[PDB]
Short mmCIF file of C-alpha atoms in Angstrom, two decimals:
data_model
loop_
_atom_site.label_atom_id
_atom_site.label_comp_id
_atom_site.label_asym_id
_atom_site.label_seq_id
_atom_site.Cartn_x
_atom_site.Cartn_y
_atom_site.Cartn_z
CA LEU W 1 3.52 8.84 50.97
CA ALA W 2 6.42 7.43 48.84
CA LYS W 3 9.52 9.82 48.11
CA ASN W 4 9.96 11.18 44.51
CA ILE W 5 13.36 11.58 43.57
CA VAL W 6 14.40 14.08 40.81
CA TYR W 7 17.88 14.06 39.49
CA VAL W 8 19.49 17.19 37.99
CA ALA W 9 22.66 17.22 35.80
CA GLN W 10 24.46 19.82 33.87
CA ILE W 11 25.57 19.40 30.37
CA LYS W 12 27.69 22.31 28.79
CA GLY W 13 29.80 22.75 25.70
CA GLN W 14 29.86 21.06 22.25
CA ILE W 15 27.96 17.90 21.60
CA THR W 16 30.63 15.16 21.16
CA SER W 17 30.63 11.34 21.68
CA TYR W 18 31.83 12.11 25.26
CA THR W 19 28.42 14.15 25.67
CA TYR W 20 26.58 11.11 24.84
CA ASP W 21 28.33 9.02 27.49
CA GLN W 22 27.52 11.78 29.97
CA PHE W 23 23.77 11.58 29.09
CA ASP W 24 24.15 7.70 29.25
CA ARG W 25 25.69 7.80 32.63
CA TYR W 26 23.45 10.29 34.27
CA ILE W 27 20.15 8.77 32.64
CA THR W 28 21.25 5.35 33.69
CA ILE W 29 21.91 6.38 37.28
CA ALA W 30 18.41 8.03 37.57
CA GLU W 31 16.69 4.98 35.90
CA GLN W 32 18.51 2.61 38.33
CA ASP W 33 17.13 4.57 41.20
CA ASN W 34 13.61 4.54 39.90
CA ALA W 35 13.72 8.42 39.73
CA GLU W 36 10.52 10.24 38.91
CA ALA W 37 12.46 12.44 36.42
CA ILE W 38 15.95 13.51 35.47
CA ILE W 39 16.43 17.29 34.67
CA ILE W 40 19.30 18.02 32.29
CA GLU W 41 20.48 21.66 32.32
CA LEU W 42 21.71 22.23 29.00
CA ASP W 43 23.85 24.92 27.41
CA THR W 44 25.31 24.05 24.08
CA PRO W 45 26.20 25.87 20.89
CA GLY W 46 25.90 22.40 19.11
CA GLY W 47 28.25 19.75 17.90
CA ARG W 48 28.22 16.34 16.10
CA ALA W 49 25.07 15.20 14.31
CA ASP W 50 25.66 11.60 15.10
CA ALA W 51 26.29 12.15 18.80
CA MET W 52 23.08 14.15 18.77
CA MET W 53 21.15 11.20 17.26
CA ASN W 54 22.48 8.82 19.74
CA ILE W 55 21.56 11.22 22.48
CA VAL W 56 18.07 11.56 21.06
CA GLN W 57 17.62 7.91 20.96
CA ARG W 58 18.88 7.31 24.45
CA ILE W 59 16.41 9.75 25.78
CA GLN W 60 13.68 8.10 23.69
CA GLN W 61 14.33 4.83 25.20
CA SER W 62 14.80 6.15 28.74
CA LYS W 63 12.63 4.46 31.24
CA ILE W 64 12.03 7.74 33.21
CA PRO W 65 11.08 11.18 31.93
CA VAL W 66 14.02 13.33 30.67
CA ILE W 67 13.36 17.10 30.93
CA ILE W 68 15.81 19.28 28.95
CA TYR W 69 16.17 22.61 30.78
CA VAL W 70 17.92 25.25 28.82
CA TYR W 71 19.70 27.05 31.79
CA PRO W 72 21.23 29.00 33.17
CA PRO W 73 19.88 32.37 31.84
CA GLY W 74 22.21 33.28 28.98
CA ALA W 75 22.47 29.62 27.85
CA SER W 76 21.26 28.36 24.59
CA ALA W 77 20.20 24.91 23.03
CA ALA W 78 21.43 25.80 19.57
CA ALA W 79 21.92 23.66 16.50
CA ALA W 80 22.20 19.90 17.67
CA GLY W 81 21.13 20.99 21.16
CA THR W 82 17.60 21.89 19.69
CA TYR W 83 17.17 18.29 18.55
CA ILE W 84 18.07 17.01 22.06
CA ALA W 85 15.33 19.20 23.22
CA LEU W 86 12.76 18.32 20.76
CA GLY W 87 13.36 14.65 21.37
CA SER W 88 12.95 14.82 25.05
CA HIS W 89 9.79 14.39 27.35
CA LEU W 90 9.41 18.01 28.42
CA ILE W 91 11.33 21.20 27.48
CA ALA W 92 11.82 24.05 29.88
CA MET W 93 13.68 27.30 29.29
CA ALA W 94 14.93 29.85 31.69
CA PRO W 95 14.26 33.62 30.79
CA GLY W 96 17.20 35.05 28.67
CA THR W 97 17.86 31.60 26.98
CA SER W 98 17.63 30.69 23.23
CA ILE W 99 16.61 27.71 21.14
CA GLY W 100 16.98 27.10 17.61
CA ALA W 101 19.39 28.11 14.79
CA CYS W 102 19.92 24.64 13.19
CA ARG W 103 20.99 25.60 9.45
CA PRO W 104 23.24 22.59 8.75
CA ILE W 105 26.65 23.42 7.81
CA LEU W 106 29.86 21.30 6.76
CA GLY W 107 32.19 23.82 8.40
CA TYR W 108 34.23 27.08 7.59
CA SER W 109 35.88 27.27 4.09
CA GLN W 110 39.30 27.78 2.66
CA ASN W 111 39.01 31.56 2.23
CA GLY W 112 35.80 33.81 2.28
CA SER W 113 32.80 31.62 3.12
CA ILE W 114 30.71 29.11 5.19
CA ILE W 115 30.17 25.74 3.66
CA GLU W 116 26.38 25.07 3.37
CA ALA W 117 25.17 21.61 3.43
CA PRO W 118 23.80 20.57 0.06
CA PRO W 119 19.84 20.51 -0.28
CA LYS W 120 19.58 16.71 0.12
CA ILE W 121 21.37 16.67 3.31
CA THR W 122 19.53 19.77 4.41
CA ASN W 123 16.13 17.94 3.56
CA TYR W 124 17.14 14.90 5.41
CA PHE W 125 17.70 17.09 8.66
CA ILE W 126 14.29 18.84 7.94
CA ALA W 127 12.51 15.51 7.80
CA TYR W 128 14.39 14.44 11.16
CA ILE W 129 13.76 17.75 13.17
CA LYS W 130 10.00 17.60 11.97
CA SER W 131 9.55 14.04 13.07
CA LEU W 132 10.89 14.92 16.63
CA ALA W 133 8.37 17.77 16.81
CA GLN W 134 5.49 15.69 15.32
CA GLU W 135 6.35 12.84 17.68
CA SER W 136 6.16 15.09 20.77
CA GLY W 137 3.11 17.09 19.63
CA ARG W 138 5.47 20.22 19.23
CA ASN W 139 5.25 22.79 16.42
CA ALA W 140 6.83 21.08 13.36
CA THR W 141 6.45 24.34 11.15
CA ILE W 142 8.79 26.37 13.54
CA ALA W 143 11.08 23.20 14.01
CA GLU W 144 11.53 23.40 10.09
CA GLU W 145 12.29 27.08 10.27
CA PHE W 146 14.98 26.52 12.72
CA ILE W 147 16.78 24.99 9.78
CA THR W 148 15.39 26.86 6.75
CA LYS W 149 15.56 30.48 8.32
CA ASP W 150 18.19 29.63 11.03
CA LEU W 151 15.35 30.83 13.34
CA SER W 152 16.16 31.25 16.91
CA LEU W 153 13.56 31.84 19.72
CA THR W 154 13.52 33.42 23.09
CA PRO W 155 11.59 31.44 25.91
CA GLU W 156 8.33 33.30 25.59
CA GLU W 157 8.41 32.90 21.74
CA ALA W 158 9.17 29.29 22.04
CA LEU W 159 6.25 28.98 24.51
CA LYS W 160 3.75 30.91 22.67
CA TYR W 161 4.42 29.08 19.38
CA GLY W 162 4.04 25.59 20.88
CA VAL W 163 7.78 24.54 20.89
CA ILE W 164 8.27 24.14 24.75
CA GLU W 165 6.20 23.44 27.72
CA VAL W 166 7.63 25.59 30.50
CA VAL W 167 9.46 28.79 31.27
CA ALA W 168 11.13 28.69 34.66
CA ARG W 169 13.63 30.90 36.48
CA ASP W 170 15.09 27.93 38.35
CA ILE W 171 14.61 24.08 39.31
CA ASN W 172 12.15 25.12 41.89
CA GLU W 173 9.84 27.04 39.54
CA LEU W 174 10.49 24.22 36.70
CA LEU W 175 9.09 21.55 39.32
CA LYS W 176 6.17 23.84 40.37
CA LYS W 177 4.90 24.53 36.64
CA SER W 178 5.84 21.09 35.45
CA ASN W 179 4.03 19.38 38.17
CA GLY W 180 0.77 17.55 36.84
CA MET W 181 1.96 17.80 33.11
CA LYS W 182 1.94 14.69 30.72
CA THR W 183 5.27 13.88 29.04
CA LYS W 184 5.24 14.90 25.40
CA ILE W 185 6.56 11.42 24.21
CA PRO W 186 5.91 8.12 25.76
CA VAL W 187 7.67 6.52 28.62
CA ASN W 188 7.42 2.68 28.11
CA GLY W 189 4.44 3.26 25.90
CA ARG W 190 2.65 5.75 28.37
CA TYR W 191 2.31 9.41 28.51
CA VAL W 192 3.19 9.58 32.27
CA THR W 193 1.81 12.64 34.45
CA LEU W 194 4.76 14.16 36.26
CA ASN W 195 4.29 14.15 39.95
CA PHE W 196 6.51 16.80 41.79
CA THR W 197 4.58 17.23 44.99
CA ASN W 198 7.11 16.31 47.80
CA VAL W 199 10.25 15.63 45.87
CA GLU W 200 13.93 15.13 46.76
CA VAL W 201 16.12 16.84 44.32
CA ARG W 202 19.50 15.33 44.06
CA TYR W 203 22.45 16.78 41.93
CA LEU W 204 24.58 14.36 39.83
CA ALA W 205 28.25 15.60 39.54
CA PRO W 206 30.88 15.02 36.82
CA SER W 207 34.74 14.49 37.45
CA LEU D 1 45.42 -5.59 -2.14
CA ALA D 2 41.77 -4.05 -1.80
CA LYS D 3 38.67 -6.10 -2.93
CA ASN D 4 35.14 -5.07 -3.23
CA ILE D 5 33.16 -7.24 -0.82
CA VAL D 6 29.56 -7.66 -0.28
CA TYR D 7 28.36 -9.34 2.74
CA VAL D 8 24.94 -11.28 2.87
CA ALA D 9 23.21 -12.37 5.97
CA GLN D 10 19.81 -13.71 6.74
CA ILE D 11 17.25 -12.54 9.45
CA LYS D 12 14.11 -14.52 9.85
CA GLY D 13 11.29 -14.54 12.49
CA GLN D 14 9.99 -12.14 15.00
CA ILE D 15 11.86 -9.10 15.81
CA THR D 16 13.21 -9.17 19.32
CA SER D 17 16.14 -7.79 21.26
CA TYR D 18 18.09 -10.74 20.06
CA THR D 19 17.46 -9.61 16.51
CA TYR D 20 18.91 -6.40 17.24
CA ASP D 21 22.25 -8.25 18.47
CA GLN D 22 22.14 -10.23 15.03
CA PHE D 23 21.92 -6.85 12.99
CA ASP D 24 24.54 -5.42 15.42
CA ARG D 25 26.93 -8.46 14.83
CA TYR D 26 26.44 -8.69 11.10
CA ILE D 27 26.75 -4.98 10.35
CA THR D 28 29.72 -4.82 12.75
CA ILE D 29 31.59 -7.42 10.78
CA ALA D 30 31.03 -5.90 7.38
CA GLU D 31 32.17 -2.42 8.77
CA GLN D 32 35.24 -3.97 10.20
CA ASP D 33 36.10 -5.57 6.89
CA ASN D 34 35.47 -2.25 4.83
CA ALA D 35 32.66 -3.97 2.90
CA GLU D 36 31.04 -2.04 -0.09
CA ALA D 37 27.54 -3.15 1.34
CA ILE D 38 25.85 -5.65 3.48
CA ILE D 39 22.73 -7.33 2.27
CA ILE D 40 20.24 -8.34 4.75
CA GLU D 41 17.66 -10.96 3.51
CA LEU D 42 14.75 -10.22 5.77
CA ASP D 43 11.62 -12.32 6.34
CA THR D 44 9.66 -11.08 9.45
CA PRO D 45 5.97 -10.73 10.49
CA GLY D 46 6.83 -8.10 12.89
CA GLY D 47 7.94 -7.73 16.62
CA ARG D 48 8.86 -5.38 19.24
CA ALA D 49 8.69 -1.68 18.53
CA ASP D 50 11.88 -0.79 20.77
CA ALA D 51 14.01 -3.39 19.13
CA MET D 52 12.86 -2.09 15.59
CA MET D 53 13.95 1.42 16.65
CA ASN D 54 17.40 0.26 17.80
CA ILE D 55 17.79 -1.79 14.38
CA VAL D 56 16.71 1.34 12.53
CA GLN D 57 19.15 3.44 14.24
CA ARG D 58 21.99 0.90 14.00
CA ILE D 59 21.45 0.99 10.15
CA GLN D 60 21.19 4.65 10.04
CA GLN D 61 24.76 5.04 11.88
CA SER D 62 26.26 2.12 9.88
CA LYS D 63 29.56 3.06 8.10
CA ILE D 64 28.62 1.02 5.04
CA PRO D 65 25.35 0.85 3.05
CA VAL D 66 22.77 -1.76 4.51
CA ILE D 67 20.41 -3.05 1.82
CA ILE D 68 17.26 -4.62 3.04
CA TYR D 69 16.26 -7.37 0.74
CA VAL D 70 12.72 -8.99 1.28
CA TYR D 71 13.57 -12.62 0.44
CA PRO D 72 13.11 -15.51 -0.32
CA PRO D 73 9.99 -15.47 -2.42
CA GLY D 74 6.99 -15.85 0.09
CA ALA D 75 8.85 -13.71 2.63
CA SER D 76 7.49 -10.42 3.99
CA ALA D 77 8.73 -7.29 5.70
CA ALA D 78 5.48 -6.74 7.59
CA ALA D 79 4.83 -4.47 10.61
CA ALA D 80 8.22 -3.70 12.50
CA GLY D 81 9.98 -5.16 9.31
CA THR D 82 8.56 -2.28 7.25
CA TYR D 83 10.40 0.17 9.37
CA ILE D 84 13.61 -1.61 9.04
CA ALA D 85 13.29 -1.56 5.37
CA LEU D 86 12.16 2.23 5.21
CA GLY D 87 15.22 2.96 7.51
CA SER D 88 17.76 1.42 5.07
CA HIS D 89 20.04 2.59 2.52
CA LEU D 90 18.26 0.60 -0.38
CA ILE D 91 15.42 -1.85 -0.39
CA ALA D 92 15.00 -4.70 -2.72
CA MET D 93 12.12 -7.12 -2.90
CA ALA D 94 12.01 -10.77 -4.44
CA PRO D 95 8.80 -11.33 -6.70
CA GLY D 96 6.06 -12.99 -4.39
CA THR D 97 6.94 -10.81 -1.36
CA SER D 98 5.06 -8.42 0.74
CA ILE D 99 5.77 -5.28 2.53
CA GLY D 100 3.66 -3.21 4.98
CA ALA D 101 0.57 -3.91 7.06
CA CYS D 102 1.75 -1.84 10.17
CA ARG D 103 -1.42 -1.00 11.99
CA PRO D 104 -0.13 -0.79 15.56
CA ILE D 105 -1.96 -3.28 17.66
CA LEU D 106 -1.53 -4.30 21.37
CA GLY D 107 -2.79 -7.91 21.16
CA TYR D 108 -6.23 -9.52 21.63
CA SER D 109 -8.72 -8.73 24.49
CA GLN D 110 -10.77 -10.82 27.11
CA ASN D 111 -13.14 -11.26 24.14
CA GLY D 112 -11.28 -12.25 20.95
CA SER D 113 -11.14 -8.48 19.98
CA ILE D 114 -8.31 -6.98 18.23
CA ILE D 115 -6.91 -4.17 20.60
CA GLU D 116 -5.95 -1.21 18.66
CA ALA D 117 -3.26 1.20 19.91
CA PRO D 118 -4.54 4.45 21.32
CA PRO D 119 -4.72 7.30 18.72
CA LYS D 120 -1.69 9.14 20.24
CA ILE D 121 0.62 6.18 20.14
CA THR D 122 -0.67 5.78 16.54
CA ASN D 123 0.04 9.28 15.49
CA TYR D 124 3.55 8.82 17.13
CA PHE D 125 4.20 5.74 14.80
CA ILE D 126 2.82 7.67 11.80
CA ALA D 127 5.21 10.54 12.48
CA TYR D 128 7.96 7.93 12.81
CA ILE D 129 7.25 6.00 9.54
CA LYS D 130 6.78 9.06 7.63
CA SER D 131 10.13 10.30 8.75
CA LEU D 132 11.80 7.25 7.52
CA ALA D 133 10.28 7.68 4.22
CA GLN D 134 11.14 11.57 3.98
CA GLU D 135 14.53 10.91 5.07
CA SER D 136 15.13 8.31 2.41
CA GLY D 137 13.11 10.14 -0.48
CA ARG D 138 10.57 7.45 -0.35
CA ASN D 139 6.64 7.80 -0.55
CA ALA D 140 5.54 9.20 2.93
CA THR D 141 1.75 8.95 1.91
CA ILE D 142 2.15 5.27 1.25
CA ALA D 143 4.26 4.76 4.35
CA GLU D 144 1.40 6.59 6.38
CA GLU D 145 -1.12 4.07 4.83
CA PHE D 146 0.75 1.02 5.92
CA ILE D 147 -0.57 2.16 9.18
CA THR D 148 -3.74 3.91 8.52
CA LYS D 149 -5.24 1.35 6.17
CA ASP D 150 -3.00 -1.60 7.03
CA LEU D 151 -1.87 -1.39 3.55
CA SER D 152 0.33 -4.20 2.19
CA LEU D 153 2.12 -3.96 -1.16
CA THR D 154 3.53 -6.55 -3.82
CA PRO D 155 7.02 -5.90 -5.06
CA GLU D 156 5.88 -4.34 -8.21
CA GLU D 157 3.35 -1.95 -6.37
CA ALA D 158 6.11 -1.11 -3.90
CA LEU D 159 8.43 -0.24 -6.75
CA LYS D 160 5.73 1.64 -8.82
CA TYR D 161 4.56 3.86 -5.81
CA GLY D 162 8.22 4.73 -4.84
CA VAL D 163 8.47 2.84 -1.67
CA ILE D 164 11.45 0.54 -2.73
CA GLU D 165 14.14 0.67 -5.20
CA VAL D 166 14.83 -2.77 -6.64
CA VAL D 167 12.80 -5.81 -7.76
CA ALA D 168 15.19 -8.78 -7.84
CA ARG D 169 15.05 -12.72 -8.17
CA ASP D 170 18.32 -13.29 -6.51
CA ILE D 171 21.43 -11.77 -5.09
CA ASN D 172 22.96 -11.47 -8.57
CA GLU D 173 20.04 -9.63 -10.03
CA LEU D 174 20.03 -7.37 -6.93
CA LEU D 175 23.64 -6.53 -7.47
CA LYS D 176 23.01 -5.89 -11.22
CA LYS D 177 20.17 -3.48 -10.84
CA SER D 178 21.48 -1.85 -7.64
CA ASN D 179 25.02 -1.15 -9.30
CA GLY D 180 25.36 2.65 -9.85
CA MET D 181 22.48 3.76 -7.52
CA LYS D 182 23.05 6.09 -4.79
CA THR D 183 22.09 5.23 -1.25
CA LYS D 184 18.68 6.76 -0.30
CA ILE D 185 19.94 7.92 3.22
CA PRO D 186 23.44 9.23 3.88
CA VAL D 187 26.46 7.06 5.04
CA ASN D 188 28.32 9.31 7.48
CA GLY D 189 26.84 12.45 5.71
CA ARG D 190 27.36 11.36 2.13
CA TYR D 191 25.01 9.63 -0.45
CA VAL D 192 27.47 6.86 -1.54
CA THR D 193 27.10 5.55 -5.21
CA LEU D 194 27.03 1.56 -4.96
CA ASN D 195 29.61 -0.25 -6.99
CA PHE D 196 28.83 -3.61 -7.73
CA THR D 197 30.35 -4.14 -11.15
CA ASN D 198 32.73 -6.81 -9.87
CA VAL D 199 32.12 -7.78 -6.35
CA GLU D 200 33.02 -10.92 -4.01
CA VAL D 201 29.83 -12.07 -2.36
CA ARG D 202 30.44 -13.49 1.11
CA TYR D 203 27.74 -15.20 3.36
CA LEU D 204 27.64 -14.55 7.01
CA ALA D 205 26.37 -17.34 9.24
CA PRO D 206 24.67 -17.33 12.66
CA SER D 207 27.09 -18.00 15.48
#
């Protein structure tokens, strides 16, 4: 009989400290309204590792389920974006999206090369990405390969290999297929069953 | 002009949200003064997992090395405390101290019975504690056993099995043996070499 509210927000572009504030604001709003879940439509090529780590940790302490939805078709959750997804309660991908490609780099060089992260830093990131996968019951071998092979997956590959939970064309199909699934990580110590049966979708806007 | 300062603070008792604020304050001070390192003398039986995670993450984002020093003799870094230690740049233990015993438990039942965390939550903690070990080059098999066997180690066992870096009777011996070692986790992307040859020790007091 109660109304379930699902918020939807959009995060696009490079992950920066400002992106942290965006996730913080959107998630805080949704928590304050006792939302059933917040869906974050993500499209990013990556960004700063530190802002990623704070975003991951914000989601993990979230009092409501955060669903990372790689969207619209043509979007990716690449590099840092992949960690945001793996750190979340549920991952959905639209057809024609991409996840992965997390080979850690320091940047572009002086002259004719890319600057690869040294092996130790790379192993650090491998340990971290694998932990997000193991914590959420997702494929840690594949997660490692996002780094070691610069592996990138389509939605159907990502579903088949146990990296994501839902492939969905839009918000309404996401709600329909996600309905009745458990969060892959705890929300206040419990693996909550998502209830999307009569839900009010509300869009949160920037400015 | 530029001096080589090491701060020392003390954190005792249960880990709570207030313990987070203590680590936040002490570390912020030391970062604002461009300290070489902050040593936190830690004695805890454990506490809240969420406060532990925010403490761990505060240490990981620290702009200066954080050394967790299980001290004074008789002290322990048990349960949540073990994770604070594993999440840190360097671990030292005084002789007669203890680390480990992290079997996640909910409390006691209607009967006097110890309530074990359900298996999924346990596995979540295993994935997390192993990640802190792997990220810092420390023994992840032993780290897992802190949970699965409720394993507790003395300083000398912990050093021998590759869980800690230093056994030290006091601040001065800690400085001496720690001098010239690399941090076990990065400080903003670099593994810093600790320089303690000539250093000004300053004690931070609780407000």
